[PDB]
Enzyme design. Sequence first.
Site, short mmCIF file in Angstrom:
data_model
loop_
_atom_site.label_atom_id
_atom_site.label_comp_id
_atom_site.label_asym_id
_atom_site.label_seq_id
_atom_site.Cartn_x
_atom_site.Cartn_y
_atom_site.Cartn_z
N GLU C 255 40.69 25.19 49.61
CA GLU C 255 40.76 25.80 50.93
C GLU C 255 39.69 26.89 51.02
O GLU C 255 39.81 27.92 50.35
CB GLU C 255 42.15 26.35 51.19
N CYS C 294 39.14 35.43 56.06
CA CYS C 294 38.69 34.07 56.34
C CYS C 294 38.93 33.69 57.78
O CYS C 294 38.14 32.95 58.38
CB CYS C 294 39.42 33.11 55.42
N1 LIG Z 1 42.51 30.18 52.95
C1 LIG Z 1 41.19 30.24 53.02
O1 LIG Z 1 40.50 29.35 53.49
C2 LIG Z 1 40.50 31.47 52.52
C3 LIG Z 1 41.23 32.63 52.33
C4 LIG Z 1 40.61 33.77 51.87
C5 LIG Z 1 39.18 33.79 51.59
N2 LIG Z 1 38.50 32.52 51.83
C6 LIG Z 1 37.07 32.44 51.57
O2 LIG Z 1 36.74 33.05 50.33
C7 LIG Z 1 35.40 33.54 50.38
C8 LIG Z 1 35.29 34.91 49.72
O3 LIG Z 1 35.90 34.91 48.44
P1 LIG Z 1 35.05 34.75 47.09
O4 LIG Z 1 33.68 35.34 47.29
O5 LIG Z 1 35.78 35.47 45.98
O6 LIG Z 1 34.90 33.20 46.68
P2 LIG Z 1 34.25 32.81 45.27
O7 LIG Z 1 33.59 34.01 44.66
O8 LIG Z 1 33.24 31.71 45.49
O9 LIG Z 1 35.38 32.27 44.25
C9 LIG Z 1 36.72 32.72 44.36
C10 LIG Z 1 37.41 32.57 43.01
O10 LIG Z 1 36.85 31.49 42.27
C11 LIG Z 1 36.46 31.96 40.98
N3 LIG Z 1 35.25 31.25 40.51
C12 LIG Z 1 34.00 31.47 40.94
N4 LIG Z 1 33.12 30.65 40.32
C13 LIG Z 1 33.82 29.87 39.48
C14 LIG Z 1 33.51 28.79 38.52
N5 LIG Z 1 32.24 28.36 38.34
N6 LIG Z 1 34.54 28.25 37.83
C15 LIG Z 1 35.80 28.67 38.00
N7 LIG Z 1 36.15 29.65 38.85
C16 LIG Z 1 35.22 30.27 39.61
C17 LIG Z 1 36.16 33.42 41.20
O11 LIG Z 1 36.23 34.18 40.00
P3 LIG Z 1 35.11 35.31 39.78
O12 LIG Z 1 35.61 36.59 40.39
O13 LIG Z 1 34.88 35.48 38.30
O14 LIG Z 1 33.84 34.86 40.46
C18 LIG Z 1 37.25 33.81 42.17
O15 LIG Z 1 38.46 34.05 41.45
C19 LIG Z 1 35.03 33.63 51.85
O16 LIG Z 1 34.00 32.69 52.14
C20 LIG Z 1 36.30 33.26 52.58
O17 LIG Z 1 35.99 32.48 53.74
C21 LIG Z 1 39.14 31.44 52.27
#
Ligand SMILES: NC(=O)c1ccc[n+]([C@@H]2O[C@H](COP(=O)([O-])OP(=O)(O)OC[C@H]3O[C@@H](n4cnc5c(N)ncnc54)[C@H](OP(=O)(O)O)[C@@H]3O)[C@@H](O)[C@H]2O)c1
EC number: 3.3.2.12
Lengths: 63, 63, 678, 63
Positions: C255, C294
């Site tokens: 998601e 989001c």
């Molecule tokens: N329900 C929804 O649709 C929803 C809700 C809330 C937020 N969002 C979206 O989330 C985004 C912002 O959050 P974000 O920047 O934290 O996303 P992200 O950095 O791309 O990844 C989120 C999670 O995934 C982990 N992760 C990253 N790279 C990985 C890999 N190669 N292998 C395994 N795990 C990995 C991250 O850990 P690390 O901290 O170590 O990178 C973090 O815990 C926004 O674009 C927002 O739209 C969506």
Amino acid sequence: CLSGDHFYAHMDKIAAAESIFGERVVHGYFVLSAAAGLFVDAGVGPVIANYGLESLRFIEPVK
Amino acid sequence: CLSGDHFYAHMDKIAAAESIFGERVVHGYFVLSAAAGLFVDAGVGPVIANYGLESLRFIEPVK
Amino acid sequence: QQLASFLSGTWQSGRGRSRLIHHAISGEALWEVTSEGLDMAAARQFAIEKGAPALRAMTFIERAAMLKAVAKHLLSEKERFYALSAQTGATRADSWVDIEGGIGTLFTYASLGSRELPDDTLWPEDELIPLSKEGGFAARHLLTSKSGVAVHINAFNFPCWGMLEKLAPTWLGGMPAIIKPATATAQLTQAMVKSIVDSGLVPEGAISLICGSAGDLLDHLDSQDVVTFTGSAATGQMLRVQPNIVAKSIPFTMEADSLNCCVLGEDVTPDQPEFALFIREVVREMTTKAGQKCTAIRRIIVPQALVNAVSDALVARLQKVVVGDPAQEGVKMGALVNAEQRADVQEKVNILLAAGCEIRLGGQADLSAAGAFFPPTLLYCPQPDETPAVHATEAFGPVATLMPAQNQRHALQLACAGGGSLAGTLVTADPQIARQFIADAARTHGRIQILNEESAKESTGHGSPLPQLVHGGPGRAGGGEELGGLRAVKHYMQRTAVQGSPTMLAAISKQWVRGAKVEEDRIHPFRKYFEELQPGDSLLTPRRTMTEADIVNFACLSGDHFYAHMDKIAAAESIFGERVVHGYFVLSAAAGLFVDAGVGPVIANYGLESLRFIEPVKPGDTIQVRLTCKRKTLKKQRSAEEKPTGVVEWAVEVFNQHQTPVALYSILTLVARQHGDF
Amino acid sequence: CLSGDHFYAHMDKIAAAESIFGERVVHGYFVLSAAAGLFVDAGVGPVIANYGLESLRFIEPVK
Ligand SMILES: NC(=O)c1ccc[n+]([C@@H]2O[C@H](COP(=O)([O-])OP(=O)(O)OC[C@H]3O[C@@H](n4cnc5c(N)ncnc54)[C@H](OP(=O)(O)O)[C@@H]3O)[C@@H](O)[C@H]2O)c1
Ligand SMILES: CCCCCCCC(=O)SCCNC(=O)CCNC(=O)[C@H](O)C(C)(C)COP(=O)(O)OP(=O)(O)OC[C@H]1O[C@@H](n2cnc3c(N)ncnc32)[C@H](O)[C@@H]1OP(=O)(O)O
Ligand SMILES: CCCCCCCC(=O)SCCNC(=O)CCNC(=O)[C@H](O)C(C)(C)COP(=O)(O)OP(=O)(O)OC[C@H]1O[C@@H](n2cnc3c(N)ncnc32)[C@H](O)[C@@H]1OP(=O)(O)O
Ligand SMILES: CCCCCCCC(=O)SCCNC(=O)CCNC(=O)[C@H](O)C(C)(C)COP(=O)(O)OP(=O)(O)OC[C@H]1O[C@@H](n2cnc3c(N)ncnc32)[C@H](O)[C@@H]1OP(=O)(O)O
Ligand SMILES: CCCCCCCC(=O)SCCNC(=O)CCNC(=O)[C@H](O)C(C)(C)COP(=O)(O)OP(=O)(O)OC[C@H]1O[C@@H](n2cnc3c(N)ncnc32)[C@H](O)[C@@H]1OP(=O)(O)O
């Protein structure tokens, strides 16, 4: 309905055919109440109370 | 209404105040019929017929 | 300073190259995270062989009561949660939304699991599917739980909420969770996990925590495991093609990010209150959490003749927004969480500016400040159907672009051009415009708020995912669905169609089915207390012959003088052929036949589940009723004065002299318990 | 009387005070039946049958 007496010889068509009466019969207490409906004068008079009922026997079923 | 018994101690408000009871009382036969509404199993059982009633005394009035 | 992961019941800590948590509003590093060297196989081992059978041995009512207990324990110490959430640059209102939405999700799932989940380990979601003419072979769908773990990989935005709205359906579905929070904010997540674990309310092994990278966790998951992801669409599409996730075929509920439309309609003119609440909704949704949710509005679709009015209103309202420290007074918008997030937002703004335009203070963001401040940004796109970079790039901050439409047929296309989104919104007052909007734009949005003057008084808002509405849309939004009420707890369960005889499905489901064996035991089931009612305790009532006088007295007493009951002529020309008994009189004579008059455990009537009439009941036609117990599902005695009681459901099978089932249905009934829980 | 449902919260004055309702309440099925007394057209029209009832809940007791 009024008395609450829903006995099977009065409310069930099937069980009354398997009973001693052969079909559904009127309640004995409705015979006893409809009798007093037929003789009790409505007006104020010498009759004061009801006081009891000595010896009731039902002899033939009322249908 | 159902039995037809329209005695003045039941259907009149004035004469029941002038009677021995003080106000309108419930019919004795309705006590006798609501009692049988309370103690009778509706289902088919060993009980066959009503057969009569050995004695009866209406002791205190029901209001 | 170590931020301690919680694996195998012990607050461990990693040993390796450690990432560090910057403070948001000031800029220093006051935590550092690591998870290298932590045995993840032993963590999954301890979870599956410790907390999974302890959760699965509970009933659903016990797990809902456990969720309510953890919710009341987390509510009693929320002030340290506000103190930890102030480190993320959020204001008091933003942290209130986060913490209290995360705990209100717990109270909502406690209420739903107490009201609509059985007093059982298993859960039959169907009624019954009769698969045979005689009735000796049927089937029904059981929802048993899963004997594995739920790996939750969360974003940085809602550390409390985004963890705790996944933890509640997982726990209500009887699985232990291994939360991997985002490293940029994991201090609040460890505050939540520590407050849960140091309370004695949950079983041991029912929750884990990895502050830092997972590394060797997705390579250890069995097919009874589920993975729920929350992040960007660049990460989750690489986690979907992870070889163990596709080999063992485990459910990966991705998601991700979404460009969220907010369409103004043609009927709205700037004199109306609709225009003012449109501007207020876009401004509040873009300034809440500094635009780091989001479900924030990131594309504003307006009519062509109203672009200058919307833009002037948004400039006149958004310049009143004061960006600064949350603790000092007179500050509306807080900050971001990192300088890296600030650089990411600004480099997305430069991408949107490589093919777009500008309205306000946009890309002029200081990258040398001691704080993650980004100014509120409104953009402009004069050619919306010609620039694909607007419909493919999200600037995850206070940035939201604006673009014109042409009379509710270009606005629908610009709403659907987001590649699959989440949390759309139309602001109109004409209901057929909303009908045409849902008929085309609900294919790409997982939630659509039609905001008018009646809605806006007690509206939850654009960016408030309710715990009982499906959160998640198709396409770019991930395709996963969360928070669907009881739809979310079915991601953590296995749906199984159990075939067999109804007397076997009754013993499997711990209910009564339709043709199961009965337990007629010579006394009345209304005389039994709640603990001695078994599902299957039946009662064959005496009969009652329906006559014309019954029809007359019920039509008089109710007042239902319908022509199929009171007219000899019209009923002969109807579908029935002659006069029939009222269905409500069959329903009332049934309760005349099975209700105990005496004072007993039966308290109230509480409703009637599902009535169907099948054959007409006539004069000269007996009626016999088969009352039998079906479900028990005890209530939880919300006060100390209220009596211990439970809500027994009875299946009622009326029939006639030919034994064909006229009017089979199901009554609820509140039945007093002999023993309570207090 | 008509239905036969002589539950204690409707026909007993003492136990209805000792119940959750505080006094005697109207039957839920009589609310359900008097409602259809209030909205059903008596005349011959397009309405053919009754066909069932979807989802009933009694929220507050009727006195
Ligand atoms: N329900 C929804 O649709 C929803 C809700 C809330 C937020 N969002 C979206 O989330 C985004 C912002 O959050 P974000 O920047 O934290 O996303 P992200 O950095 O791309 O990844 C989120 C999670 O995934 C982990 N992760 C990253 N790279 C990985 C890999 N190669 N292998 C395994 N795990 C990995 C991250 O850990 P690390 O901290 O170590 O990178 C973090 O815990 C926004 O674009 C927002 O739209 C969506
Ligand atoms: C339908 C046919 C009648 C037509 C007119 C209809 C009139 C009515 O319907 S009136 C209906 C309501 N009336 C009633 O229910 C009756 C009211 N109760 C009474 O009988 C009143 O006590 C009353 C004042 C009129 C007469 O009482 P009274 O005679 O003064 O003294 P009381 O102590 O009550 O004794 C009366 C009888 O009851 C019996 N009795 C009294 N107490 C008891 C007891 N504890 N155990 C057993 N029997 C008792 C007595 O044996 C006596 O019977 P008996 O003739 O064999 O000696
Ligand atoms: C409410 C509480 C009970 C709950 C269950 C309710 C059941 C019912 O409601 S059934 C409906 C009510 N019953 C009726 O209306 C009909 C009553 N049924 C009968 O009378 C049946 O014919 C039946 C089988 C009992 C009669 O018995 P049977 O074997 O034929 O003998 P029979 O001699 O004719 O009648 C017995 C009584 O009649 C009496 N009797 C009096 N006068 C006469 C007479 N002129 N001719 C004949 N019998 C008479 C006799 O004294 C005898 O009573 P006892 O045994 O004390 O001396
Ligand atoms: C208060 C409302 C306004 C006033 C209206 C007053 C009208 C009346 O009071 S009429 C008297 C009482 N009403 C009735 O008896 C209703 C008439 N009875 C009937 O069922 C009629 O035969 C009739 C015409 C509706 C049936 O229609 P029909 O085309 O045969 O469909 P059918 O599938 O066989 O039965 C209807 C339903 O029974 C259900 N059903 C459940 N169990 C069974 C079973 N074991 N066997 C057959 N059907 C069953 C069917 O599933 C179907 O429900 P659904 O559509 O949700 O799946
Ligand atoms: C004939 C069958 C055998 C039984 C013998 C006969 C018994 C009787 O006749 S009793 C007399 C008639 N019965 C009544 O009047 C019952 C009154 N209903 C009541 O709510 C009672 O106060 C009582 C005792 C059940 C208490 O209910 P309570 O525990 O407070 O729950 P409550 O908050 O009222 O909600 C009850 C249901 O109404 C539903 N409901 C639907 N809409 C609403 C609404 N707008 N507001 C409130 N509740 C609603 C609720 O969802 C809930 O159902 P669910 O199981 O899905 O959660």
